Amino acid sequence: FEGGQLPLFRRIPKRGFTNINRKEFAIVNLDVLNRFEDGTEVTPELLVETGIIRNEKSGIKILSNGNIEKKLTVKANKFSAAAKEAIEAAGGKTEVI
Amino acid sequence: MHVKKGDKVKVITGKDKGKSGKVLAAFPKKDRVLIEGINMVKKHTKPSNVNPQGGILNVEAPIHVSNVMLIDPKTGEPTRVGYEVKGDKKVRVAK
RNA sequence: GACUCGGUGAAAUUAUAGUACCUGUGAAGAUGCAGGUUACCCGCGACAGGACGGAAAGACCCCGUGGAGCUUUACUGCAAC
RNA sequence: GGUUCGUGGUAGGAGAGCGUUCUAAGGGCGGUGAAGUCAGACCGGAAGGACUGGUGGAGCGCUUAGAAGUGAGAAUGCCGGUAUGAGUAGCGAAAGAAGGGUGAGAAUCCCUUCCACCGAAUAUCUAAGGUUUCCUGAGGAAGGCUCGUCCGCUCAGGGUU
RNA sequence: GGUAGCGGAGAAAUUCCAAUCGAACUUGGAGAUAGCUGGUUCUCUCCGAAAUAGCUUUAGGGCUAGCCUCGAGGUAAAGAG
RNA sequence: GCUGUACGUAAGCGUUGAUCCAGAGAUUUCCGAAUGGGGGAACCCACUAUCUUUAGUCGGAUAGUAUCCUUACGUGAAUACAUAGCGUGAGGAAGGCAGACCCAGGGAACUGAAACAUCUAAGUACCUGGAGGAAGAGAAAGAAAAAUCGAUUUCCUGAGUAGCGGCGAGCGAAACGGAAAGAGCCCAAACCAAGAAGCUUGCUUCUUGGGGUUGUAGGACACUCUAUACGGAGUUACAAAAGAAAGUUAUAAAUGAAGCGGUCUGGAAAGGCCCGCCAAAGACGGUAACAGCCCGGUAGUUGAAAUGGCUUUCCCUCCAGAGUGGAUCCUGAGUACGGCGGAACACGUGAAAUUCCGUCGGAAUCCGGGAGGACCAUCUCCCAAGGCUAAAUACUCCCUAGUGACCGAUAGUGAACCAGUACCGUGAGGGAAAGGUGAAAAGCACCCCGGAAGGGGAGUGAAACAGUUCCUGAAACCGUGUGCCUACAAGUAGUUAGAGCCCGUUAAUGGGUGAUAGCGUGCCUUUUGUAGAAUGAACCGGCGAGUUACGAUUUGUUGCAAGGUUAAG
Ligand SMILES: [K+]
Ligand SMILES: [K+]
Ligand SMILES: [K+]
Ligand SMILES: [K+]
Ligand SMILES: [K+]
Ligand SMILES: [K+]
Ligand SMILES: [K+]
Ligand SMILES: [Mg+2]
Ligand SMILES: [Mg+2]
Ligand SMILES: [Mg+2]
Ligand SMILES: [Mg+2]
Ligand SMILES: [Mg+2]
Ligand SMILES: [Mg+2]
Ligand SMILES: [Mg+2]
Ligand SMILES: [Mg+2]
Ligand SMILES: [Mg+2]
Ligand SMILES: [Mg+2]
Ligand SMILES: [Mg+2]
Ligand SMILES: [Mg+2]
Ligand SMILES: [Mg+2]
Ligand SMILES: [Mg+2]
Ligand SMILES: [Mg+2]
Ligand SMILES: [Mg+2]
Ligand SMILES: [Mg+2]
Ligand SMILES: [Mg+2]
Ligand SMILES: [Mg+2]
Ligand SMILES: [Mg+2]
Ligand SMILES: [Mg+2]
Ligand SMILES: [Mg+2]
Ligand SMILES: [Mg+2]
Ligand SMILES: [Mg+2]
Ligand SMILES: [Mg+2]
Ligand SMILES: [Mg+2]
Ligand SMILES: [Mg+2]
Ligand SMILES: [Mg+2]
């Protein structure tokens, strides 16, 4: 309240809409994936069992924030281009679930 | 009441401690006993239809039952009491 | 009635009070401050200038995005026709 | 423990504490006298805390923590008590007097006599209403605007065919 | 005996409806709401304002800023004379 | 031992077993729904039957007699059969509360939006009706989505999200998920049988029995196999009403260890000191003061004639269920939907799905029908218009046992006391105040003043400065007495200097008083500013104002740390 002066929110406009089929994905980085011995297989179930993840919100997504040092096969719902590149460059491989 | 009219009695506590006497009355509505020679007390009595002479009278007053202990009429010494059944008649027992 | 005697015995009020006057100052109208002037202590009956006296959170005035009652071609409605 | 600069303060911010009620634990005093209360010329920088003595006559402190119905001088505050005015206003329309008597006590009660008041009423009946206030015998705490030996007051017995 | 409150009665005055009537009394919603007044209880120590701008169906209210306090920061020490 | 609180005197009963306690019975005036009729509450007046008294009237007992609903039966009109109506009998209800919880009908405003009307407050308060111990809801015409789940309810979350909204103030879910608790069933209809009513006249159309109840559709109807009590189920739904027995529990009770230990204080010992003891018992309370060992009792162990409940057993009662076909037939009609008008769903007509009410219209009915937030198609899920259903949930006038960092008599219930009283009011209705002798009445014999009250002694008691508002007994307030000052003086009343006089202390550069001298316009509030001729307070005492729940944010602390933490349960 501002004394009958028009409030800030009433002097500016509404914006947008909430989508109903919105998909938000659990965000995994590369730094975590150094925890595993090379040549093994990473999965959603494994990442939950290890407590890295609790909520598979609408899926998993692996982002290239950081670095890996280790060869790995990874499988998830969506990857970023850069993280795919880094995984391959370490000799890893990628599957899309 | 563990003490009854007609009993012989020892006094545990009080100013009249160590003394003994008979039980002349009992009041279980108040847990008091009226005992001879114990708690004698001076009543300032105006004359009336009885005690028409009036005066200061020494008479016994009641004292509490817990201040009192029973005596076995055979030993003559004071005894805490239990209860047993003789035949089909409950009784009082010394111990 | 009031006044004195005898009996009985309230009230409104009340910050504490050993409660003068003039002139002045001061929230601009002082029993209470200043400076001067008067004034031994305690009461009784009478008067009412002041205590901006008592009573009644001014009824005048203004304010409140307070209220009630009334009016109408104010607005929106309702019954009834 | 030192040096330098400071140390008026409303609204208001910040901090450190005093004290009350209760709880837990530890450790205590207290019928050879607790809390409380009364008086004191003691203590601490403050809120406040001890000591002594009297009264009281059975419970209460201290320590460290914790929790709060937490500390009043004002609200034309609320309830209770007591003042002030103040021995004041008032004692509620009216004619009483004296003698005898009762009685601890009499303007006030009872009796007598004179006097005075109402008299289309201040009389006699009776509804409504009130509900024992009627009668008798005792009584005088309170009530009665004084008084009281009296009462429509208090007690106890009766009384309405 | 009848008429009862969004009502009734009025030879009509806002008159009367149990000492209340421009809309009874009581109980409840109800601790109505009150930008209004009043009040708000112990101590010390440090610091210490404002009564301005702007906007406001706003003017004795409020909001933001200016002014106070407390804490933490950061340095190419920026403040003051 | 007893004849209550409740003293008293009188008179009496009790071990040939009282008073008392528990269970079941009996009796239970009059009023009140109040019911034989009336009625101004607790009053009045009756009738019909049988009996009784009187010489007979008069009078007395006992039983029945309300209204409505349903049901039979009998009478019975206009009107002719008949129905209405009337009467009788068998059942049933009526009314009250616990100011609580829930279901429906009806339904505000104050307030908030810093006006206000949509909106909010709020489907709240209130009225009314129905109830029941819970109610309501409920066994998918569901929730959902590349995967399915399997009745309802309640809780945690989702989430203050999605969204609604003068898109303002504000209103605000649901599902998934996780838990408590768990349970599933019955009709209708086709179809068979009987009966009656129409003769719908060889067809219906109503009352009962069987049959059957559902979605990959199920059933009737055809067959096979079983089945007639083999076995199973049950009064908590699935049908309903009874009975016994056993055990357990509740409503009375019983038994129950150990110090009269010594000594000190003391009015009194339960306390101090020194010795012991018991403990499945050191709960509580009482007792002349603080008791495990004094009393009642507690732990423990026992027990109930009678009645009530629960759990089991028996009796009793009652019980066709699988399969394959699928000619045909059935599957909730004036509903389901739609229009109009309103409402409930978080959803304010908004694009407005879903549910409900009123009124208009008005389907298909299995190659059918609904929903998936307008709507269309496809897909998926599901069968409405009929009914029942425990448990988990909500509340507490009550009973039993118990608890409190709850009150402790201006508190705590309004009410610790004869309080919903006194009192106020015509009434509805409002509504107080008021606790404490003592361990024990031992409650002051007797004397004196006095008419009494009240005192002073005496005496009781530890104590009467504990004496019938009686533990303690503050302050305002009223007084008695006295050490110092005061009748030439004004002064917010004190302070500072200070003589003289008087005392002697928590002993310290002390106390009380103050001639006289200097200075000095209360407190609070609100104000630019108040001694203020502005406000408030008579005084004294008590009570009397930032708190709690949930959430946001920040600071500090602690723990773990790219981890941390669990909620319900
Ligand atoms: K005057
Ligand atoms: K003392
Ligand atoms: K009235
Ligand atoms: K039900
Ligand atoms: K005890
Ligand atoms: K709609
Ligand atoms: K569905
Ligand atoms: Mg504006
Ligand atoms: Mg005069
Ligand atoms: Mg005014
Ligand atoms: Mg300062
Ligand atoms: Mg308080
Ligand atoms: Mg005068
Ligand atoms: Mg006079
Ligand atoms: Mg005349
Ligand atoms: Mg008389
Ligand atoms: Mg008198
Ligand atoms: Mg006029
Ligand atoms: Mg309200
Ligand atoms: Mg109010
Ligand atoms: Mg300063
Ligand atoms: Mg408003
Ligand atoms: Mg004592
Ligand atoms: Mg539809
Ligand atoms: Mg519509
Ligand atoms: Mg709505
Ligand atoms: Mg319709
Ligand atoms: Mg859709
Ligand atoms: Mg008291
Ligand atoms: Mg009270
Ligand atoms: Mg006293
Ligand atoms: Mg002189
Ligand atoms: Mg003045
Ligand atoms: Mg005043
Ligand atoms: Mg006061």
From Swiss-Prot, chain A:
It comes from the Bacteria. GO terms for molecular function: rRNA binding; structural constituent of ribosome. GO terms for biological process: translation. Coiled coil: none annotated. Binds to the 23S rRNA. Belongs to the universal ribosomal protein uL15 family. This is Large ribosomal subunit protein uL15. The gene is rplO. The chain holds residues 50 to 146 of 146 of the full protein.
Curated annotation (Swiss-Prot), chain B:
Keywords: Ribonucleoprotein, Ribosomal protein, RNA-binding, rRNA-binding. Belongs to the universal ribosomal protein uL24 family. One of its GO terms (biological process) is translation. NCBIfam families: rplX_bact (TIGR01079). Gene3D superfamilies: 2.30.30.30. One of its GO terms (cellular component) is cytosolic large ribosomal subunit. The keyword Metal-binding does not apply. This is Large ribosomal subunit protein uL24. Part of the 50S ribosomal subunit.
